[PDB]
Amino acid sequence: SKHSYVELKDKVIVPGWPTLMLEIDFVGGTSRNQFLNIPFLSVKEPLQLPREKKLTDYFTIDVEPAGHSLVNIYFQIDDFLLLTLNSLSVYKDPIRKYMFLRLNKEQSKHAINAAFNVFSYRLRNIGVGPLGPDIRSSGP
Amino acid sequence: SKHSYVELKDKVIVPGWPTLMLEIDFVGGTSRNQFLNIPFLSVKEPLQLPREKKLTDYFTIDVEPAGHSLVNIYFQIDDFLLLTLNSLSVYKDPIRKYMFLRLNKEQSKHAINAAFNVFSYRLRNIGVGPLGPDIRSSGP
Amino acid sequence: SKHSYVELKDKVIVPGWPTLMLEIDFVGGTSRNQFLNIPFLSVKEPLQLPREKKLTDYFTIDVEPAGHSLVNIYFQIDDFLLLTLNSLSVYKDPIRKYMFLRLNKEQSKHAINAAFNVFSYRLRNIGVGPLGPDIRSSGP
Amino acid sequence: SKHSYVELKDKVIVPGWPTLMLEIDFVGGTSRNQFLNIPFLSVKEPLQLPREKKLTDYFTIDVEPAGHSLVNIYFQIDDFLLLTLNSLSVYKDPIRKYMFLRLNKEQSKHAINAAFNVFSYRLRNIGVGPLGPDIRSSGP
Numbered sequence: 001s002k003h004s005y006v007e008l009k010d011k012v013i014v015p016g017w018p019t020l021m022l023e024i025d026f027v028g029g030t031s032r033n034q035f036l037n038i039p040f041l042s043v044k045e046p047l048q049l050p051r052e053k054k055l056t057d058y059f060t061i062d063v064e065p066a067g068h069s070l071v072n073i074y075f076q077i078d079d080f081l082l083l084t085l086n087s088l089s090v091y092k093d094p095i096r097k098y099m100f101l102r103l104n105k106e107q108s109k110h111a112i113n114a115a116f117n118v119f120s121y122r123l124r125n126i127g128v129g130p131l132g133p134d135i136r137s138s139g140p
Numbered sequence: 141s142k143h144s145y146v147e148l149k150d151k152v153i154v155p156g157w158p159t160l161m162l163e164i165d166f167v168g169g170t171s172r173n174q175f176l177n178i179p180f181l182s183v184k185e186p187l188q189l190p191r192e193k194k195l196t197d198y199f200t201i202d203v204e205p206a207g208h209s210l211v212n213i214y215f216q217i218d219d220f221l222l223l224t225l226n227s228l229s230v231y232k233d234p235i236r237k238y239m240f241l242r243l244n245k246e247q248s249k250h251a252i253n254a255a256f257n258v259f260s261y262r263l264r265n266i267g268v269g270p271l272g273p274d275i276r277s278s279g280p
Numbered sequence: 281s282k283h284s285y286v287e288l289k290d291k292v293i294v295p296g297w298p299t300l301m302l303e304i305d306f307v308g309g310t311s312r313n314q315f316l317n318i319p320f321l322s323v324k325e326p327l328q329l330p331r332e333k334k335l336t337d338y339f340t341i342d343v344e345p346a347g348h349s350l351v352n353i354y355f356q357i358d359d360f361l362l363l364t365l366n367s368l369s370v371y372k373d374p375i376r377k378y379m380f381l382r383l384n385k386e387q388s389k390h391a392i393n394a395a396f397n398v399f400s401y402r403l404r405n406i407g408v409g410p411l412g413p414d415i416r417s418s419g420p
Numbered sequence: 421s422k423h424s425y426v427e428l429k430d431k432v433i434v435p436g437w438p439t440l441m442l443e444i445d446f447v448g449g450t451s452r453n454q455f456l457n458i459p460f461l462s463v464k465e466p467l468q469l470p471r472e473k474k475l476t477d478y479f480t481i482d483v484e485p486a487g488h489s490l491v492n493i494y495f496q497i498d499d500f501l502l503l504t505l506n507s508l509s510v511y512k513d514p515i516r517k518y519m520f521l522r523l524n525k526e527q528s529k530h531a532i533n534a535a536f537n538v539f540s541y542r543l544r545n546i547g548v549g550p551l552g553p554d555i556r557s558s559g560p
């Protein structure tokens with residue numbers, strides 16, 4: 001049936017927790033040319049998909065223009081990954097099957113200069129900094 | 141008689157449809173130096189002007205400063221091209237004879253650093269992404 | 281006596297008229313490193329100071345931080361130059377003896393990365409574009 | 421006990437006074453790769469810590485993501501340094517033990533592209549410009 005692509009807001013990123021970086025390469029290969037690194041989600045446990053399976057099997061993305069300078073990235077997340085991410089997530093199950101996040105002027109120019117052509121993309125686990133635990137517990 | 145240069149707003153760009161990229165080269169030649177790629181218009185069918193005719197015959201542009209950091213690009217569109225674009229357009233005939241679009245801080249610095257001197261410019265057809273059709277139909 | 285550095289706003293830049301570009305070089309020499317090109321003023325006639333005299337004799341600038349990311353450029357304009365600019369100006373005599381203009385996030389990073397050290401600076405005349413005269417007369 | 425990381429706002433930077441630049445290097449070494457230079461504090465006297473002691477002994481920082489594009493830098497300042505900075509500060513003792521400052525879109529991309537990994541960081545004294553004294557005294 002019909003759906004809507006819901007927005008993955010910034011609140012899903014919590015300072016002090018490890019992060020899942022969405023890394024995108026465009027026209028070339030290994031940092032060959034245009035790319036984007038995007039803090040995607042704050043997590044409790046690091047993501048580690050099954051041996052066999054590829055991220056491409058559960059994750060599909062589409063970089064699209066949203067104006068003369070801004071760009072959005074659309075997401076289609078498979079149940080397995082949706083379930084996975086929601087259990088790792090620091091923020092209460094924010095992930096859905098159809099999403100998108102807005103890029104800023106700076107991030108968008110890279111997408112635009114590559115005519116939105118995605119070569120490869122992955123989700124990398126980024127550890128916490130020296131004040132990480134102190135930061136998240138020292139709320140107001 | 142007198143006219144006004146009307147603004148080509150972002151609403152004319154619809155995520156999920158193919159796009160017409162406005163590509164601009166400045167002082168050098170083939171990406172020799174400063175350049176700009178600008179999502180110009182969302183289209184149903186790709187643009188493909190007549191054999192002979194050159195884009196320069198129907199299209200004239202002028203990059204001008206609009207402040208100490210922002211720049212605007214002015215357009216003068218010939219009837220043939222105005223008619224063409226309006227029929228391809230996803231958004232209801234937004235194109236007029238005299239227009240202009242605002243560049244953002246990021247895009248403007250390139251224009252400024254080349255003292256607004258346009259060497260060449262074209263309109264390229266950009267295809268749709270993997271979720272393209274699903275994106276435009278999955279409205280709210 | 282006491283004064284205030286007044287702001288040189290964007291309204292002094294009028295699309296369609298020739299411009300005076302404020303060019304700044306920082307730590308190195310000929311585009312050796314960090315630099316800034318800033319549309320400074322819209323003019324009717326191009327600036328052309330006396331044979332002998334140097335711009336440095338009438339113009340003094342100071343790049344200063346205004347926050348953790350924004351920077352301002354302060355100006356001290358000599359009577360001769362103040363008088364000159366005000367007569368060339370498209371906007372009604374906006375120039376004063378003590379001024380400053382705000383840089384945007386993008387422009388500021390270059391100033392910041394050079395620790396505000398100005399090596400050289402000049403005012404260059406920038407001609408008008410192909411639609412220049414039509415642009416300024418085709419007001420609303 | 422519990423605390424909050426207070427924000428080091430821009431008001432602590434006063435145009436016309438010397439500055440303390442927070443310089444950060446990320447994954448590589450000597451400007452090897454990603455870095456950040458941040459106007460940190462306006463001071464009356466330049467900072468000059470004891471012979472032996474290292475800045476790392478009184479200062480600890482943590483670069484953390486705060487959204488899909490913005491980043492914050494968290495600080496933990498030791499009493500010695502807190503006392504030092506507050507006496508040099510042009511703005512009335514703004515420094516506290518636990519702080520953080522927001523980075524802008526432009527500054528954040530560098531932090532993000534290095535996955536927030538800090539290699540080294542220091543506080544450099546930046547002198548005043550040619551109109552420095554005139555600027556701070558020529559208030560409104």
Ligand SMILES: Nc1ccn([C@@H]2O[C@H](COP(=O)(O)O)[C@@H](O)[C@H]2O)c(=O)n1
Pocket residue numbers: 033034035036037110529533
């Ligand atoms: N977020 C970023 C930052 C840089 N880049 C790439 O790095 C090149 C150099 O830009 P930097 O000055 O940011 O290192 C760019 O022209 C672009 O190919 C990118 O594609 N995405």
Ligand SMILES: Nc1ccn([C@@H]2O[C@H](COP(=O)(O)O)[C@@H](O)[C@H]2O)c(=O)n1
Pocket residue numbers: 109113173174175176177250
């Ligand atoms: N939109 C853009 C992006 C990059 N560029 C060119 O690419 C060079 C490298 O910038 P990037 O880091 O964006 O690749 C710039 O100095 C400029 O000549 C441009 O002219 N317009």
Ligand SMILES: Nc1ccn([C@@H]2O[C@H](COP(=O)(O)O)[C@@H](O)[C@H]2O)c(=O)n1
Pocket residue numbers: 249253313314315316317390
């Ligand atoms: N407005 C600008 C644009 C570029 N630059 C210089 O050009 C270098 C390459 O940046 P671009 O990608 O903008 O060409 C920068 O690292 C900087 O030294 C500058 O100093 N001021």
Ligand SMILES: Nc1ccn([C@@H]2O[C@H](COP(=O)(O)O)[C@@H](O)[C@H]2O)c(=O)n1
Pocket residue numbers: 389393453454455456457530
């Ligand atoms: N504030 C800045 C400016 C530049 N840079 C570095 O300088 C490289 C070239 O960027 P510029 O065009 O700004 O000189 C960047 O790819 C990045 O490695 C940085 O890391 N932080």
